[PDB]
């Protein structure tokens, strides 16, 4: 099987560097080097993310889409930056304006064809394609607009292969941009109707989870990114490993989406202990479920405790008892019968790889489909209206060839999306 990553925008891009920083080491691939793999198993399934050309050069099969040179020229001028074949860099030296409209209708719409071109060169690579990984932020141009287009096109070209989306939904407390809800509401819209698996991460849900669950005092972006990339590795790549009970994107999809919206999840990693001290090793297993299922530790902003779950997928990856795994999951399902929805006898989807995260003994990625994420699109949707009402920075959109009915559309859509999700919380 296979997949083809997609680094839309700067963020989605910045993260690319971290997702690939990791994944590679979790596959023994040095900058341009080959497979130094401490083992021999980190190779029989690599294909999922690379391509064979030389014999020591397995190149990441991702796409780097962005209308701001400097960015990709920071990712390509640093560490692992020199492993991507230049063909991968689909830049847009234009003005990468922070407008969803500027990267979806006017500026991005041009650079698109020169992207799809490659997304096909990579898809028609070899063997059988599974789906595409998509990273980006719903709070900017090259991210929400242009990346949200990249998919609307992808999903027309292969409505068969899957589409996981890793979105950095606009954090609450403080917005790292101003129109944010504009660029956001507009991209979520496109998401709820193309990709079929979305993993929403919040820069501040991370800080928290990174400053209190990792006594880490100076959580640089690199970190946040790093933590995130840690989860997306547990998801995909991982399951493309052996296991007593293994799954793969689809299983994950076909066990997690009760209703076609596409629904968004909230990823959570397992061993998340501070370096030295904490290295408690309390990782027998009840310790991992202890972790994963708590409020804090959910990369999302919202707290599960604020709304039932529809599905859950503990994708563990480290030798354990299909008994102490299958078992724990249960008590968990009974101690919290309250929030776990009922019309699904077994919400949880236990998954079990074998080999764990390179240096760790036992981990377990969590992919939750809780109704709690209602209380986020609400947020976003609110911010919109409060500012849409006055058409705040709307001239930067319309003036870019947009529509007063376009914004209406998205909000509603994504706004209805909130509605539905409640239809199950009840």
């Amino acid at each position: 099987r296979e997949i083809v990553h997609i680094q839309a925008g700067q963020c989605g891009n910045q993260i690319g560097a971290k997702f690939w920083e990791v994944i590679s080491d979790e596959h023994g691939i040095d900058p341009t080097g080959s497979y130094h793999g401490d083992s021999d198993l980190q190779l029989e399934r690599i294909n999922v993310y690379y391509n064979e050309a030389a014999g020591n050069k397995y190149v990441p099969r991702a796409i780097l889409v962005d209308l701001e040179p400097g960015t990709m020229d920071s990712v390509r001028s640093g560490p692992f930056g020199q492993i991507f074949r230049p063909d991968n860099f689909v830049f847009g030296q234009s003005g990468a304006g922070n407008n969803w409209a500027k990267g979806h209708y006017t500026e991005g719409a041009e650079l698109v064809d020169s992207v799809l071109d490659v997304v096909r060169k990579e898809s028609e690579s070899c063997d059988c394609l599974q789906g595409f990984q998509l990273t980006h932020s719903l709070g900017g141009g090259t991210g929400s607009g242009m990346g949200t287009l990249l998919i609307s096109k992808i999903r027309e070209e292969y409505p068969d292969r899957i589409m996981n989306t890793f979105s950095v939904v606009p954090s609450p407390k403080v917005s790292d941009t101003v129109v944010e809800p504009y660029n956001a509401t507009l991209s979520v819209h496109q998401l709820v109707e193309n990709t079929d698996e979305t993993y929403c991460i919040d820069n501040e849900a991370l800080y928290d989870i990174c400053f209190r669950t990792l006594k880490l005092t100076t959580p640089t972006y690199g970190d946040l990114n790093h933590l995130v990339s840690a989860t997306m590795s547990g998801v995909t790549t991982c399951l493309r490993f052996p296991g007593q009970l293994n799954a793969d994107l689809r299983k994950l999809a076909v066990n997690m989406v009760p209703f076609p919206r596409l629904h968004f999840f909230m990823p959570g990693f397992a061993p998340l202990t501070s370096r030295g001290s904490q290295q408690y090793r309390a990782l027998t297993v009840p310790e991992l479920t202890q972790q994963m299922f708590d409020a804090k530790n959910m990369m999302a902003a919202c707290d599960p405790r604020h709304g039932r779950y529809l599905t859950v997928a503990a994708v563990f990856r480290g030798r354990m008892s299909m008994k102490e795994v299958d078992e724990q999951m249960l008590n968990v399902q009974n101690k919290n019968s309250s929030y776990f929805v009922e019309w699904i006898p077994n919400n949880v989807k236990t998954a079990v790889c074998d080999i764990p995260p390179r240096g760790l003994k036992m981990s377990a990625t969590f992919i939750g489909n809780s109704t709690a994420i209602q209380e986020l699109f609400k947020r976003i949707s609110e911010q919109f209206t409060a500012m849409f009402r006055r058409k705040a920075f709307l001239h930067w959109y319309t003036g870019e060839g947009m529509d007063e009915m376009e914004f209406t559309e998205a909000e509603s859509n994504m706004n209805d999306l909130v509605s539905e999700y409640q239809q199950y919380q009840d």
Partner: protein, 412 residues
Amino acid sequence: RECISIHVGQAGVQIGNACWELYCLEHGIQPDGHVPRAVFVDLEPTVIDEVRTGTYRQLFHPEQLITGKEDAANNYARGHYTIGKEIIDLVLDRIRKLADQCTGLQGFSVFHSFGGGTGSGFTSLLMERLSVDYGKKSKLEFSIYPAPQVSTAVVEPYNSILTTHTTLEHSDCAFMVDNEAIYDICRRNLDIERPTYTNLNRLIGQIVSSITASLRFDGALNVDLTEFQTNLVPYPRGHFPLATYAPVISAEKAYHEQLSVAEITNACFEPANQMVKCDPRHGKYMACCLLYRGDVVPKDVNAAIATIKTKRTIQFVDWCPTGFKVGINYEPPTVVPGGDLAKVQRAVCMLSNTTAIAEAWARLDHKFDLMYAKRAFVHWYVGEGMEEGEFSEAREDMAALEKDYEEVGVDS
């Protein structure tokens, strides 16, 4: 990513030399280092010459220094139409030659002095020709609008009611720094009855450094230029916020310097510290961009601001829940080696749109009428390719700027 700058008018050039000074000063690039990223326009050679004779002499390219040996003329008309015209092409050429060389820019920080000849008129058409050649960017013009009672030129208003109406439909965000209301700061918050123009310049030269310089510079809460206009203008009128700085303490007299955030932020809303004689006499803020720099804990802010949001006597507009764009930078400010600026390890350059200017514009409009009412120095413009139209029709213009700044506030 970048932001070109066009310093127009002797003043905009003096202030320019200043803001341009503070720059290298906090970037370790002495007299002769890299290459600027702006231009200088004036219809009076002797002034741009000062940049050609005095300090920061070789840090510029005789190409980004435009001059029209001809005549300045403290009159809009002449500077905009008649004379100023001849140069514009050439002027543009640089902001098209300098705009190309770069990599995905963001806009042009324009520096002009509202009530001048080369500053009001000229720019009027410079910004004019920009809004069309790059409508797809930011046009933040940093102005030094007419001292409330201490104006200079006899006509000033003619020149400022005219630079406002012609630029209004072309700027993105117009920053304003009142020449007089800055003196107060030099008298009351620094103590000195000897303020040379070279000082006011060091000041804006500061507040400005907080805008571009440091902001376009990495930090814990970056704020792009676009960011401004977005988080700063509620309506298309090239809305004019006001610039304010916090640690404007004297580097000699008093010394309490160590004035934790909680203090420097409160020191922004007291009207006696805002580089503008627009004392919040009633003007409800409608959006403030608190740009901090130096050692600042986000909670300190996301608290110091909270305390403010609940002072009520600071009444924010209705239709605006929260209007506080918190911009955090790292590197503390950088004071002139030995001017008169304290030199703290944290500052607050807060700018904002306040229903207050309802005043400032009013008081400046009224001026105009009085003279127009008698045509006063009208023959000076007419004879310079203008008409009863441009005046009367630019008066009506601002009229709806007195109603605009009135409607967007005072009402719920």
